[PDB]
Amino acid sequence: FLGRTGSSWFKIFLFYLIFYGCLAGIFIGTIQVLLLTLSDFEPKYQDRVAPPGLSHAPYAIKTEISFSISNPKSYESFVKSMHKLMDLYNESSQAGNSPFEDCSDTPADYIKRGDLDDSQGQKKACRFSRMWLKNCGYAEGKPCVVAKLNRIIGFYPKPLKNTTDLPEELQANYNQYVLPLRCAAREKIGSIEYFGLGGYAGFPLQYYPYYGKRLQKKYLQPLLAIQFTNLTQNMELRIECKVYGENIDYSEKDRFRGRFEVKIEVKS
Template identity: 55%
Template sequence: MAGNKDSDGGWRRFLWNSEKGEFLGRTGCSWFKIFMFYLIFYGCLAGIFIGTIQAMLLTLSNYKPTYQDRVAPPGLSHTPRSLKSEIAFNRSDKSTYEKYVKSLEDLLHPYTDELQTEQMKFEDCGVTPDSYKDRGSAEAEAGQRMACRFYRSLLDKCSGESDASFGFKEGKPCLIVKLNRIVNFRPRAPDNHSLPEAVQNIQMANVIPIHCKNKREGEEDKVGEIQYYGMGQGFPLQYYPYYGKRLHPQYLQPLVAIHFTNVTQNQEVRIECKVYGANIDYSEKDRYQGRFEVKFTITS
């Protein structure tokens, strides 16, 4: 019992020693010194951290990326998208393709004619492919840049204007394709010799063409006829470069609609689409770099 009392007294003495005026083994002066030490120490660390962040921010632009060395331009994306790029639906059951139709409508809403009427924000850039629309450097001195109009009516049967189901009701679905936005990127037209035969007849001076075909050998008949709608069967160069969200907030990137008019039904059909440009590469690690694959399963 005496040992327990001594032990209890030892703990109480450690918490507060009235004889020496110590709290947790330190006097008030000692606590003040250690508090000041850590205050100065961590204050200096915080100052160094804030200083390095501020120094880094001075090297960055508010209008364009300073470093783009890890960007592999450009990605090719399609709408509608689904899990594992598989588009499966029953053309007789509207509920099975309603989500695809909605995603297409959402994509095309900004391309509605009525939303492109402001003369200070939009300009006509022609209805045929043309060269780059140079609007200066990607800095703030010229203010916000005007955007080329791109009307959804250019997408013809895949515009949603004449057919609200975008072909899904008839088992002839549409895909709408775009090149992903990269600030100040200028895609270059391809060399005619590097193109597949089906694309070589396109006038490519000012357009980045796109072409789709069967992914598996010997399945050409399953894919059937493919029609392309847009401007010049590809991405016209007058819509480039893109200046970023701050300088180009109303920018509309060009679209290409791909209409699969005779896909074999009740079977799985794999299709690969590629864009062709002198500075567009493909990567085995990224299946959306300059291309994409899609699998159709259409039942009736």
């Protein structure tokens, strides 16, 4: 033929069949032992998610949400993702004492449901009403963005203490139980309005620590609705929403490390 005879062509097939078969069987074996060394409830390493990311619902083309108020299908793209998220926080999804629980309607302290063990059933998560998100189809004019803190197993978000000076200096400082979120731009051509649990501009600490998908399915993380009823129009406004805390840090590279990058433009 090309290389060899039929007899040789066969033998080279019988070899590579057994050979690659063995190699596949060995590869799988090493994957088995790897998995055997891992927990079902907690990942081996967590230093790469460490400082929590802050992500929002409006799917930004490039950290930007520009549209026209005087146009219907101009914002119907951002309403798709906005709906996708909030559709999960339905009351019909949170039914019965299992696996949900009614928690303080005001920001409270942490809740420990034991260890990362299966020695108990599904760890009961705090309910969250999308109805706590006042004012927010969504904002056809002047968007109503929804913030979110990335989930990390066993992470206890710790707010800053009012020992020294603060950006939003001491205003509504629920020091003991709220992780604040203050959006900014100089360039003050807007109108910041925050909505959340208990009416505070933060995340209620009663939703922590997260026990993971395996030990807490259907779990709901707290949301923080933000509305920009800015009196300006037809210009790119670089708005940055920042979260503050002891366990919260940022990076010049990762522009989502505990903060937002939104470029709103109501070009109408």
